[PDB]
Amino acid sequence: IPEQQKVILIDEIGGYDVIKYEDYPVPSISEEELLIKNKYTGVNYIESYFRKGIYPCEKPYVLGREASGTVVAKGKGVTNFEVGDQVAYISNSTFAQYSKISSQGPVMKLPKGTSDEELKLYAAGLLQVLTALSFTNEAYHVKKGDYVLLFAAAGGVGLILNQLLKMKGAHTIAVASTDEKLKIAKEYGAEYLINASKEDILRQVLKFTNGKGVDASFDSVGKDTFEISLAALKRKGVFVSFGNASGLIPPFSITRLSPKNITLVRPQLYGYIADPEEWKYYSDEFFGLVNSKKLNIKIYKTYPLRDYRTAAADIESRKTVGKLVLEIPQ
Amino acid sequence: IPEQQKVILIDEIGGYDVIKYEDYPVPSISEEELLIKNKYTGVNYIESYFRKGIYPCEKPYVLGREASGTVVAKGKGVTNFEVGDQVAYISNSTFAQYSKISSQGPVMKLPKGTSDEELKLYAAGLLQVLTALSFTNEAYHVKKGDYVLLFAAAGGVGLILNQLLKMKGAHTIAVASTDEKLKIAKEYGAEYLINASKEDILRQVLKFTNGKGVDASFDSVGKDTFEISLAALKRKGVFVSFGNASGLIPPFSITRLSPKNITLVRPQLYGYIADPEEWKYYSDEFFGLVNSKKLNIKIYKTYPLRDYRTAAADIESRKTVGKLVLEIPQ
Ligand SMILES: NC(=O)C1=CN([C@@H]2O[C@H](COP(=O)(O)OP(=O)(O)OC[C@H]3O[C@@H](n4cnc5c(N)ncnc54)[C@H](OP(=O)(O)O)[C@@H]3O)[C@@H](O)[C@H]2O)C=CC1
Ligand SMILES: NC(=O)C1=CN([C@@H]2O[C@H](COP(=O)(O)OP(=O)(O)OC[C@H]3O[C@@H](n4cnc5c(N)ncnc54)[C@H](OP(=O)(O)O)[C@@H]3O)[C@@H](O)[C@H]2O)C=CC1
């Protein structure tokens, strides 16, 4: 195990030029930790918030949220994992050849002899599926018959949400920026389609819901959609605001939730997988759905780790559908 | 039916001197409305928000939220009520000898022979019981074994919540400004007591919840308890912010709900009794609980309508427990 490795990091906030592919230390591990050599890591929109200074982080800051790979070292007290075990896990600093995580943390042991193709699939699906599952179970518990507004409907999280909402018998009103995206959203389970580049979103939502509004809004767009979601919600509806793609929602007076008794939730994945029991619940569900092919994980493109800047530009351009994946160099 | 009556109104914002006991027209009614002669009307803290300019209202503004009385006139299209019916109802402009409401609104027909004491009881209990029922059913669905933080615990809504939370098998952590008030909260079902005037609230909450925090906070205090509730909540906890006794909560970034996946609700009673089906559900439940004295309605003091200003001063002084009621001389 080397002293140094290649990672993607940022030294400061800014545009794509601040993304660096550089030598960086391999982390040391404690008695309960795993050292994992990564093979694949998923691209997630959140990296843009850190890069732009929307979310704070101590810099130099190694990027990444999830990875799949192989345990190459373990602490003295680790019995639930073996060296050579193939794993998928949620962790920072995963745009890297080597990352560490607690053996008690959000790491799942994959079946022995898992292939590289499957490893890529798990790296592509893990974070976004866990997010979709937990947000539709706990943030707002989606019921059969619910009308649900879904923004960024053909994106990574969006395509998983489409599938889950269909499975649950919800009526999904999908919003995306092109007709070609909405076609894919439909393929993935969306019932009603709104092209935000052509149509009045609120007017269409009210049309599809008989003027009543939606039971819940799963809205990852933030600033530019806040007023639309609030207006589109039915009385007693639930607003799950879970992203900032168009910017942060400015500070608001919670009195605005009152006329329609709107419930507000601004969740993050971590808070639903924080215990071993919560992690086992959702990671087991993730595995079952993906393995049985009940959930499809659409991969837009795979890029070498050093090409993350291209992936960042692609996803932020709004051109993409599904998941972008980065191949970690051996 | 007279053309003129007496009411309590405000012409402008300010202190108690702006509360006026004034001549005012008896309202004209539409074909679907009832005219009700009031006997009793409850005091509610919300009147302070309108008087101080915290909540906007068109002035001159007649005060009141709830009353009990007798139907003295109805519109030609009304068949679900008769002249002579005794009623309990939720309506504005009820600090008055005569008020109107839609026959399709939140008004309930009381049994023939309802006594004067019962009329008083219903006017004392209606708004606060409906609030407590709906907020513990829908705003946050209280479960057996939940730890629940309760501010203003010996107040009108507070004493109802203490009783309901106990009935549901929840564990109430009651917060109030004196030991004497807390003794009453305990009598009404509180399991834990915190004197906000001399204790470290968060430290006591963490003691009582064994470090976990509360499952929900029912917090009617607003500005000055915002931070404490957020800190006191368990991971995945629900914040039911439902009053502004200390002032409005200033605008804040909803990302502050993210570290603990906190659900936020800022409900108003109306939004849970907005249609005939919802109104029937909660008003039937209110009646059973209050008529049977399963729920106790503590009356602090009864004032004549003309003396609302003393009641306003009393409740705002923080010296009161339970409900203040206004009696209208007939
Ligand atoms: N709270 C949490 O724990 C998590 C939150 N997220 C959030 O969910 C969202 C989806 O993540 P992910 O699947 O990685 O990304 P996506 O693949 O969905 O890409 C982002 C999409 O957002 C839409 N969008 C709307 N407005 C803008 C804008 N002004 N600029 C750029 N894109 C915009 C675009 O679709 P279109 O053009 O069709 O509108 C774009 O394709 C992100 O906002 C992300 O931050 C993701 C995972 C966990
Ligand atoms: N959202 C809704 O639909 C409804 C909201 N409400 C709200 O619920 C709360 C209770 O109403 P109600 O029972 O009528 O009133 P209360 O009888 O509870 O009287 C208000 C109590 O609030 C407490 N309080 C805390 N901080 C302050 C402060 N800075 N100034 C004055 N009082 C303070 C006091 O108790 P202590 O000294 O022990 O702290 C006081 O006794 C109110 O905030 C009201 O606006 C009521 C009904 C419906």
Side-chain angles (χ1 to χ4, degrees), chain B residues 44-46 49 127-128 131 135 152 155-157 176-177 181 220-221 242-246 266-269 315 318 322:
Chain B
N44 295 283
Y45 211 78
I46 193 177
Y49 310 145
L127 189 148
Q128 297 177 347
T131 296
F135 287 12
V157 179
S177 63
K181 284 184 158 192
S220 62
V221 179
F242 75 97
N244 325 290
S246 74
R266 206 302 176 189
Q268 284 179 337
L269 170 61
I315 197 176
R318 303 175 76 160

PDB file of all heavy atoms in Angstrom, chain B residues 44-46 49 127-128 131 135 152 155-157 176-177 181 220-221 242-246 266-269 315 318 322, ligand 2:
ATOM      1  N   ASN B  44     -58.453  33.791  23.214  1.00  0.00           N
ATOM      2  CA  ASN B  44     -57.345  33.088  22.562  1.00  0.00           C
ATOM      3  C   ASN B  44     -56.168  34.019  22.397  1.00  0.00           C
ATOM      4  O   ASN B  44     -56.350  35.199  22.104  1.00  0.00           O
ATOM      5  CB  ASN B  44     -57.800  32.557  21.206  1.00  0.00           C
ATOM      6  CG  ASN B  44     -58.878  31.513  21.339  1.00  0.00           C
ATOM      7  OD1 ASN B  44     -58.599  30.364  21.673  1.00  0.00           O
ATOM      8  ND2 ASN B  44     -60.128  31.914  21.101  1.00  0.00           N
ATOM      9  N   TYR B  45     -54.959  33.486  22.573  1.00  0.00           N
ATOM     10  CA  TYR B  45     -53.762  34.300  22.505  1.00  0.00           C
ATOM     11  C   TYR B  45     -53.574  35.028  21.175  1.00  0.00           C
ATOM     12  O   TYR B  45     -52.984  36.111  21.145  1.00  0.00           O
ATOM     13  CB  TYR B  45     -52.507  33.495  22.878  1.00  0.00           C
ATOM     14  CG  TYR B  45     -51.464  34.375  23.517  1.00  0.00           C
ATOM     15  CD1 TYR B  45     -51.585  34.756  24.848  1.00  0.00           C
ATOM     16  CD2 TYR B  45     -50.377  34.862  22.784  1.00  0.00           C
ATOM     17  CE1 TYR B  45     -50.651  35.575  25.445  1.00  0.00           C
ATOM     18  CE2 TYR B  45     -49.431  35.689  23.379  1.00  0.00           C
ATOM     19  CZ  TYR B  45     -49.579  36.043  24.710  1.00  0.00           C
ATOM     20  OH  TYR B  45     -48.676  36.868  25.329  1.00  0.00           O
ATOM     21  N   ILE B  46     -54.093  34.462  20.102  1.00  0.00           N
ATOM     22  CA  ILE B  46     -53.956  35.034  18.760  1.00  0.00           C
ATOM     23  C   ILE B  46     -54.402  36.499  18.694  1.00  0.00           C
ATOM     24  O   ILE B  46     -53.867  37.263  17.898  1.00  0.00           O
ATOM     25  CB  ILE B  46     -54.701  34.199  17.681  1.00  0.00           C
ATOM     26  CG1 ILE B  46     -54.289  34.635  16.269  1.00  0.00           C
ATOM     27  CG2 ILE B  46     -56.224  34.277  17.869  1.00  0.00           C
ATOM     28  CD1 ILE B  46     -54.921  33.814  15.165  1.00  0.00           C
ATOM     29  N   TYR B  49     -51.677  39.035  18.583  1.00  0.00           N
ATOM     30  CA  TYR B  49     -50.915  39.209  17.346  1.00  0.00           C
ATOM     31  C   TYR B  49     -51.555  40.257  16.450  1.00  0.00           C
ATOM     32  O   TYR B  49     -50.859  41.083  15.862  1.00  0.00           O
ATOM     33  CB  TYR B  49     -50.762  37.889  16.581  1.00  0.00           C
ATOM     34  CG  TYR B  49     -50.260  36.716  17.405  1.00  0.00           C
ATOM     35  CD1 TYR B  49     -50.725  35.428  17.156  1.00  0.00           C
ATOM     36  CD2 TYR B  49     -49.314  36.893  18.420  1.00  0.00           C
ATOM     37  CE1 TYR B  49     -50.277  34.342  17.898  1.00  0.00           C
ATOM     38  CE2 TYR B  49     -48.865  35.808  19.173  1.00  0.00           C
ATOM     39  CZ  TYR B  49     -49.344  34.535  18.898  1.00  0.00           C
ATOM     40  OH  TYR B  49     -48.904  33.464  19.629  1.00  0.00           O
ATOM     41  N   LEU B 127     -62.057  25.685  20.324  1.00  0.00           N
ATOM     42  CA  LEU B 127     -60.883  25.974  19.495  1.00  0.00           C
ATOM     43  C   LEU B 127     -59.649  25.227  19.982  1.00  0.00           C
ATOM     44  O   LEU B 127     -58.928  24.628  19.184  1.00  0.00           O
ATOM     45  CB  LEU B 127     -60.608  27.481  19.427  1.00  0.00           C
ATOM     46  CG  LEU B 127     -59.540  27.925  18.421  1.00  0.00           C
ATOM     47  CD1 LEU B 127     -59.868  29.295  17.861  1.00  0.00           C
ATOM     48  CD2 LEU B 127     -58.146  27.911  19.020  1.00  0.00           C
ATOM     49  N   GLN B 128     -59.402  25.260  21.287  1.00  0.00           N
ATOM     50  CA  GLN B 128     -58.169  24.675  21.819  1.00  0.00           C
ATOM     51  C   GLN B 128     -58.171  23.143  21.759  1.00  0.00           C
ATOM     52  O   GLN B 128     -57.128  22.538  21.517  1.00  0.00           O
ATOM     53  CB  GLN B 128     -57.866  25.205  23.222  1.00  0.00           C
ATOM     54  CG  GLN B 128     -57.619  26.714  23.238  1.00  0.00           C
ATOM     55  CD  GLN B 128     -57.386  27.272  24.625  1.00  0.00           C
ATOM     56  OE1 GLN B 128     -57.632  26.601  25.628  1.00  0.00           O
ATOM     57  NE2 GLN B 128     -56.922  28.520  24.689  1.00  0.00           N
ATOM     58  N   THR B 131     -57.694  22.214  18.048  1.00  0.00           N
ATOM     59  CA  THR B 131     -56.284  22.462  17.759  1.00  0.00           C
ATOM     60  C   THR B 131     -55.421  21.309  18.260  1.00  0.00           C
ATOM     61  O   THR B 131     -54.629  20.745  17.509  1.00  0.00           O
ATOM     62  CB  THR B 131     -55.847  23.786  18.397  1.00  0.00           C
ATOM     63  OG1 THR B 131     -56.576  24.851  17.775  1.00  0.00           O
ATOM     64  CG2 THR B 131     -54.352  24.024  18.209  1.00  0.00           C
ATOM     65  N   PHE B 135     -53.592  18.736  15.722  1.00  0.00           N
ATOM     66  CA  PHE B 135     -52.143  18.907  15.669  1.00  0.00           C
ATOM     67  C   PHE B 135     -51.409  17.641  16.098  1.00  0.00           C
ATOM     68  O   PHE B 135     -50.304  17.382  15.619  1.00  0.00           O
ATOM     69  CB  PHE B 135     -51.694  20.111  16.506  1.00  0.00           C
ATOM     70  CG  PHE B 135     -52.019  21.467  15.893  1.00  0.00           C
ATOM     71  CD1 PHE B 135     -52.893  21.589  14.800  1.00  0.00           C
ATOM     72  CD2 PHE B 135     -51.471  22.629  16.443  1.00  0.00           C
ATOM     73  CE1 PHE B 135     -53.194  22.849  14.263  1.00  0.00           C
ATOM     74  CE2 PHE B 135     -51.772  23.889  15.906  1.00  0.00           C
ATOM     75  CZ  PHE B 135     -52.634  23.992  14.821  1.00  0.00           C
ATOM     76  N   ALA B 152     -45.358  26.391  26.935  1.00  0.00           N
ATOM     77  CA  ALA B 152     -46.586  26.969  27.496  1.00  0.00           C
ATOM     78  C   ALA B 152     -47.499  25.858  28.014  1.00  0.00           C
ATOM     79  O   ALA B 152     -48.699  25.820  27.740  1.00  0.00           O
ATOM     80  CB  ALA B 152     -47.299  27.828  26.441  1.00  0.00           C
ATOM     81  N   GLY B 155     -50.855  26.492  29.884  1.00  0.00           N
ATOM     82  CA  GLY B 155     -51.805  27.387  29.229  1.00  0.00           C
ATOM     83  C   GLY B 155     -53.016  26.647  28.718  1.00  0.00           C
ATOM     84  O   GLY B 155     -53.218  25.467  29.020  1.00  0.00           O
ATOM     85  N   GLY B 156     -53.832  27.344  27.936  1.00  0.00           N
ATOM     86  CA  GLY B 156     -55.077  26.772  27.441  1.00  0.00           C
ATOM     87  C   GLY B 156     -54.854  25.562  26.556  1.00  0.00           C
ATOM     88  O   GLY B 156     -55.331  24.462  26.854  1.00  0.00           O
ATOM     89  N   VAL B 157     -54.108  25.749  25.472  1.00  0.00           N
ATOM     90  CA  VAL B 157     -53.802  24.626  24.599  1.00  0.00           C
ATOM     91  C   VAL B 157     -52.922  23.619  25.336  1.00  0.00           C
ATOM     92  O   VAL B 157     -53.089  22.410  25.173  1.00  0.00           O
ATOM     93  CB  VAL B 157     -53.124  25.082  23.287  1.00  0.00           C
ATOM     94  CG1 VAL B 157     -52.783  23.883  22.411  1.00  0.00           C
ATOM     95  CG2 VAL B 157     -54.029  26.031  22.532  1.00  0.00           C
ATOM     96  N   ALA B 176     -42.793  25.475  31.432  1.00  0.00           N
ATOM     97  CA  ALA B 176     -43.576  26.635  31.859  1.00  0.00           C
ATOM     98  C   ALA B 176     -42.714  27.556  32.714  1.00  0.00           C
ATOM     99  O   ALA B 176     -41.590  27.201  33.074  1.00  0.00           O
ATOM    100  CB  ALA B 176     -44.829  26.204  32.610  1.00  0.00           C
ATOM    101  N   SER B 177     -43.243  28.735  33.044  1.00  0.00           N
ATOM    102  CA  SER B 177     -42.421  29.781  33.662  1.00  0.00           C
ATOM    103  C   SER B 177     -42.379  29.768  35.189  1.00  0.00           C
ATOM    104  O   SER B 177     -41.599  30.504  35.784  1.00  0.00           O
ATOM    105  CB  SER B 177     -42.840  31.166  33.152  1.00  0.00           C
ATOM    106  OG  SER B 177     -44.175  31.438  33.525  1.00  0.00           O
ATOM    107  N   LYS B 181     -47.191  26.645  38.036  1.00  0.00           N
ATOM    108  CA  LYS B 181     -47.766  26.238  36.753  1.00  0.00           C
ATOM    109  C   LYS B 181     -47.436  24.785  36.426  1.00  0.00           C
ATOM    110  O   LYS B 181     -48.283  24.047  35.927  1.00  0.00           O
ATOM    111  CB  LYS B 181     -47.267  27.137  35.627  1.00  0.00           C
ATOM    112  CG  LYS B 181     -47.902  28.500  35.575  1.00  0.00           C
ATOM    113  CD  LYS B 181     -47.372  29.235  34.360  1.00  0.00           C
ATOM    114  CE  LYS B 181     -48.296  30.334  33.949  1.00  0.00           C
ATOM    115  NZ  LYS B 181     -47.917  30.837  32.604  1.00  0.00           N
ATOM    116  N   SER B 220     -45.300  26.647  20.818  1.00  0.00           N
ATOM    117  CA  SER B 220     -46.142  27.793  20.481  1.00  0.00           C
ATOM    118  C   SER B 220     -45.485  29.129  20.805  1.00  0.00           C
ATOM    119  O   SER B 220     -46.114  30.190  20.696  1.00  0.00           O
ATOM    120  CB  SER B 220     -47.473  27.695  21.221  1.00  0.00           C
ATOM    121  OG  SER B 220     -47.284  27.731  22.623  1.00  0.00           O
ATOM    122  N   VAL B 221     -44.213  29.084  21.187  1.00  0.00           N
ATOM    123  CA  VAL B 221     -43.530  30.280  21.669  1.00  0.00           C
ATOM    124  C   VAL B 221     -42.855  31.073  20.546  1.00  0.00           C
ATOM    125  O   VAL B 221     -42.702  32.292  20.650  1.00  0.00           O
ATOM    126  CB  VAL B 221     -42.574  29.944  22.837  1.00  0.00           C
ATOM    127  CG1 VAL B 221     -41.852  31.184  23.332  1.00  0.00           C
ATOM    128  CG2 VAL B 221     -43.363  29.323  23.980  1.00  0.00           C
ATOM    129  N   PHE B 242     -46.317  26.366  16.319  1.00  0.00           N
ATOM    130  CA  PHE B 242     -47.734  26.724  16.152  1.00  0.00           C
ATOM    131  C   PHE B 242     -48.189  27.994  16.873  1.00  0.00           C
ATOM    132  O   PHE B 242     -49.386  28.257  16.976  1.00  0.00           O
ATOM    133  CB  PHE B 242     -48.655  25.520  16.445  1.00  0.00           C
ATOM    134  CG  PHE B 242     -48.799  25.179  17.908  1.00  0.00           C
ATOM    135  CD1 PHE B 242     -49.890  25.650  18.640  1.00  0.00           C
ATOM    136  CD2 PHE B 242     -47.863  24.366  18.548  1.00  0.00           C
ATOM    137  CE1 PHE B 242     -50.037  25.336  19.986  1.00  0.00           C
ATOM    138  CE2 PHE B 242     -48.002  24.034  19.898  1.00  0.00           C
ATOM    139  CZ  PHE B 242     -49.098  24.520  20.622  1.00  0.00           C
ATOM    140  N   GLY B 243     -47.244  28.790  17.352  1.00  0.00           N
ATOM    141  CA  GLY B 243     -47.581  30.078  17.951  1.00  0.00           C
ATOM    142  C   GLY B 243     -46.438  31.044  17.871  1.00  0.00           C
ATOM    143  O   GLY B 243     -45.330  30.685  17.453  1.00  0.00           O
ATOM    144  N   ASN B 244     -46.705  32.277  18.288  1.00  0.00           N
ATOM    145  CA  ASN B 244     -45.717  33.350  18.220  1.00  0.00           C
ATOM    146  C   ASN B 244     -45.671  34.155  19.512  1.00  0.00           C
ATOM    147  O   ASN B 244     -45.507  35.371  19.470  1.00  0.00           O
ATOM    148  CB  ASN B 244     -46.027  34.316  17.058  1.00  0.00           C
ATOM    149  CG  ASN B 244     -46.623  33.629  15.847  1.00  0.00           C
ATOM    150  OD1 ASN B 244     -45.951  32.884  15.140  1.00  0.00           O
ATOM    151  ND2 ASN B 244     -47.898  33.901  15.588  1.00  0.00           N
ATOM    152  N   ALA B 245     -45.815  33.494  20.660  1.00  0.00           N
ATOM    153  CA  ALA B 245     -45.938  34.234  21.919  1.00  0.00           C
ATOM    154  C   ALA B 245     -44.760  35.174  22.190  1.00  0.00           C
ATOM    155  O   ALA B 245     -44.938  36.247  22.770  1.00  0.00           O
ATOM    156  CB  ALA B 245     -46.159  33.287  23.094  1.00  0.00           C
ATOM    157  N   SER B 246     -43.568  34.775  21.753  1.00  0.00           N
ATOM    158  CA  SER B 246     -42.370  35.582  21.966  1.00  0.00           C
ATOM    159  C   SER B 246     -41.996  36.380  20.720  1.00  0.00           C
ATOM    160  O   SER B 246     -40.970  37.061  20.697  1.00  0.00           O
ATOM    161  CB  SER B 246     -41.195  34.698  22.395  1.00  0.00           C
ATOM    162  OG  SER B 246     -40.701  33.945  21.300  1.00  0.00           O
ATOM    163  N   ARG B 266     -45.892  24.394  10.413  1.00  0.00           N
ATOM    164  CA  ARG B 266     -46.397  25.565  11.090  1.00  0.00           C
ATOM    165  C   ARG B 266     -47.906  25.667  10.786  1.00  0.00           C
ATOM    166  O   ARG B 266     -48.328  26.431  10.011  1.00  0.00           O
ATOM    167  CB  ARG B 266     -45.662  26.813  10.623  1.00  0.00           C
ATOM    168  CG  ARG B 266     -45.646  27.914  11.652  1.00  0.00           C
ATOM    169  CD  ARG B 266     -47.048  28.312  12.034  1.00  0.00           C
ATOM    170  NE  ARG B 266     -47.049  29.319  13.090  1.00  0.00           N
ATOM    171  CZ  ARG B 266     -48.119  29.713  13.717  1.00  0.00           C
ATOM    172  NH1 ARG B 266     -49.293  29.212  13.383  1.00  0.00           N
ATOM    173  NH2 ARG B 266     -48.000  30.657  14.601  1.00  0.00           N
ATOM    174  N   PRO B 267     -48.671  24.821  11.460  1.00  0.00           N
ATOM    175  CA  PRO B 267     -50.074  24.648  11.122  1.00  0.00           C
ATOM    176  C   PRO B 267     -50.984  25.714  11.719  1.00  0.00           C
ATOM    177  O   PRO B 267     -50.614  26.402  12.678  1.00  0.00           O
ATOM    178  CB  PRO B 267     -50.397  23.287  11.739  1.00  0.00           C
ATOM    179  CG  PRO B 267     -49.553  23.239  12.959  1.00  0.00           C
ATOM    180  CD  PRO B 267     -48.261  23.922  12.560  1.00  0.00           C
ATOM    181  N   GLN B 268     -52.162  25.837  11.122  1.00  0.00           N
ATOM    182  CA  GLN B 268     -53.271  26.572  11.715  1.00  0.00           C
ATOM    183  C   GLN B 268     -54.487  25.664  11.725  1.00  0.00           C
ATOM    184  O   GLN B 268     -54.642  24.804  10.857  1.00  0.00           O
ATOM    185  CB  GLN B 268     -53.539  27.880  10.966  1.00  0.00           C
ATOM    186  CG  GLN B 268     -52.514  28.963  11.299  1.00  0.00           C
ATOM    187  CD  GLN B 268     -52.734  30.269  10.558  1.00  0.00           C
ATOM    188  OE1 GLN B 268     -53.366  30.307   9.502  1.00  0.00           O
ATOM    189  NE2 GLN B 268     -52.192  31.354  11.108  1.00  0.00           N
ATOM    190  N   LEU B 269     -55.338  25.842  12.727  1.00  0.00           N
ATOM    191  CA  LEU B 269     -56.492  24.967  12.908  1.00  0.00           C
ATOM    192  C   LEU B 269     -57.354  24.861  11.655  1.00  0.00           C
ATOM    193  O   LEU B 269     -57.766  23.760  11.292  1.00  0.00           O
ATOM    194  CB  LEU B 269     -57.334  25.438  14.099  1.00  0.00           C
ATOM    195  CG  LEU B 269     -58.698  24.761  14.267  1.00  0.00           C
ATOM    196  CD1 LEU B 269     -58.566  23.252  14.485  1.00  0.00           C
ATOM    197  CD2 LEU B 269     -59.475  25.405  15.410  1.00  0.00           C
ATOM    198  N   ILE B 315     -53.891  37.302  30.377  1.00  0.00           N
ATOM    199  CA  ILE B 315     -53.247  36.200  29.651  1.00  0.00           C
ATOM    200  C   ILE B 315     -51.837  36.589  29.179  1.00  0.00           C
ATOM    201  O   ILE B 315     -50.905  35.777  29.231  1.00  0.00           O
ATOM    202  CB  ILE B 315     -54.149  35.635  28.506  1.00  0.00           C
ATOM    203  CG1 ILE B 315     -53.650  34.254  28.050  1.00  0.00           C
ATOM    204  CG2 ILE B 315     -54.279  36.634  27.342  1.00  0.00           C
ATOM    205  CD1 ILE B 315     -54.535  33.575  26.988  1.00  0.00           C
ATOM    206  N   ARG B 318     -48.719  36.367  31.620  1.00  0.00           N
ATOM    207  CA  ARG B 318     -48.199  35.009  31.870  1.00  0.00           C
ATOM    208  C   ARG B 318     -48.617  34.434  33.225  1.00  0.00           C
ATOM    209  O   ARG B 318     -48.126  33.379  33.634  1.00  0.00           O
ATOM    210  CB  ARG B 318     -46.672  34.957  31.704  1.00  0.00           C
ATOM    211  CG  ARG B 318     -46.218  35.425  30.329  1.00  0.00           C
ATOM    212  CD  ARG B 318     -44.714  35.486  30.190  1.00  0.00           C
ATOM    213  NE  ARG B 318     -44.141  34.150  30.032  1.00  0.00           N
ATOM    214  CZ  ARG B 318     -42.937  33.907  29.525  1.00  0.00           C
ATOM    215  NH1 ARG B 318     -42.160  34.911  29.120  1.00  0.00           N
ATOM    216  NH2 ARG B 318     -42.508  32.656  29.420  1.00  0.00           N
ATOM    217  N   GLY B 322     -54.754  27.456  31.925  1.00  0.00           N
ATOM    218  CA  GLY B 322     -56.009  27.081  31.314  1.00  0.00           C
ATOM    219  C   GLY B 322     -56.662  28.188  30.503  1.00  0.00           C
ATOM    220  O   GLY B 322     -55.987  29.058  29.960  1.00  0.00           O
TER     221      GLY B 322
HETATM  222  N1  LIG C   2     -51.679  27.532  15.165  1.00  0.00           N
HETATM  223  C1  LIG C   2     -52.991  27.539  15.678  1.00  0.00           C
HETATM  224  O1  LIG C   2     -54.027  27.197  14.934  1.00  0.00           O
HETATM  225  C2  LIG C   2     -53.236  27.911  17.102  1.00  0.00           C
HETATM  226  C3  LIG C   2     -52.230  28.534  17.828  1.00  0.00           C
HETATM  227  N2  LIG C   2     -52.399  28.892  19.134  1.00  0.00           N
HETATM  228  C4  LIG C   2     -51.209  29.368  19.850  1.00  0.00           C
HETATM  229  O2  LIG C   2     -50.953  28.487  20.923  1.00  0.00           O
HETATM  230  C5  LIG C   2     -50.460  29.199  22.047  1.00  0.00           C
HETATM  231  C6  LIG C   2     -51.382  28.945  23.235  1.00  0.00           C
HETATM  232  O3  LIG C   2     -52.607  29.636  23.049  1.00  0.00           O
HETATM  233  P1  LIG C   2     -53.559  29.915  24.311  1.00  0.00           P
HETATM  234  O4  LIG C   2     -53.843  28.642  25.021  1.00  0.00           O
HETATM  235  O5  LIG C   2     -54.690  30.738  23.819  1.00  0.00           O
HETATM  236  O6  LIG C   2     -52.641  30.831  25.238  1.00  0.00           O
HETATM  237  P2  LIG C   2     -52.010  30.406  26.663  1.00  0.00           P
HETATM  238  O7  LIG C   2     -53.062  30.214  27.682  1.00  0.00           O
HETATM  239  O8  LIG C   2     -51.095  29.252  26.506  1.00  0.00           O
HETATM  240  O9  LIG C   2     -51.157  31.707  27.034  1.00  0.00           O
HETATM  241  C7  LIG C   2     -49.912  31.965  26.423  1.00  0.00           C
HETATM  242  C8  LIG C   2     -48.787  31.318  27.222  1.00  0.00           C
HETATM  243  O10 LIG C   2     -47.619  31.380  26.435  1.00  0.00           O
HETATM  244  C9  LIG C   2     -46.483  31.342  27.272  1.00  0.00           C
HETATM  245  N3  LIG C   2     -45.414  32.251  26.806  1.00  0.00           N
HETATM  246  C10 LIG C   2     -44.154  31.872  26.417  1.00  0.00           C
HETATM  247  N4  LIG C   2     -43.451  32.972  26.081  1.00  0.00           N
HETATM  248  C11 LIG C   2     -44.238  34.059  26.253  1.00  0.00           C
HETATM  249  C12 LIG C   2     -44.023  35.426  26.062  1.00  0.00           C
HETATM  250  N5  LIG C   2     -42.831  35.890  25.675  1.00  0.00           N
HETATM  251  N6  LIG C   2     -45.050  36.310  26.334  1.00  0.00           N
HETATM  252  C13 LIG C   2     -46.269  35.852  26.795  1.00  0.00           C
HETATM  253  N7  LIG C   2     -46.479  34.494  26.976  1.00  0.00           N
HETATM  254  C14 LIG C   2     -45.476  33.617  26.716  1.00  0.00           C
HETATM  255  C15 LIG C   2     -46.954  31.717  28.677  1.00  0.00           C
HETATM  256  O11 LIG C   2     -46.774  30.600  29.510  1.00  0.00           O
HETATM  257  P3  LIG C   2     -45.419  30.473  30.375  1.00  0.00           P
HETATM  258  O12 LIG C   2     -45.254  31.748  31.167  1.00  0.00           O
HETATM  259  O13 LIG C   2     -45.588  29.292  31.294  1.00  0.00           O
HETATM  260  O14 LIG C   2     -44.251  30.292  29.428  1.00  0.00           O
HETATM  261  C16 LIG C   2     -48.427  32.047  28.516  1.00  0.00           C
HETATM  262  O15 LIG C   2     -49.211  31.662  29.634  1.00  0.00           O
HETATM  263  C17 LIG C   2     -50.416  30.659  21.633  1.00  0.00           C
HETATM  264  O16 LIG C   2     -49.119  30.952  21.168  1.00  0.00           O
HETATM  265  C18 LIG C   2     -51.391  30.738  20.488  1.00  0.00           C
HETATM  266  O17 LIG C   2     -51.110  31.803  19.604  1.00  0.00           O
HETATM  267  C19 LIG C   2     -53.572  28.629  19.797  1.00  0.00           C
HETATM  268  C20 LIG C   2     -54.638  28.010  19.161  1.00  0.00           C
HETATM  269  C21 LIG C   2     -54.573  27.582  17.726  1.00  0.00           C
END
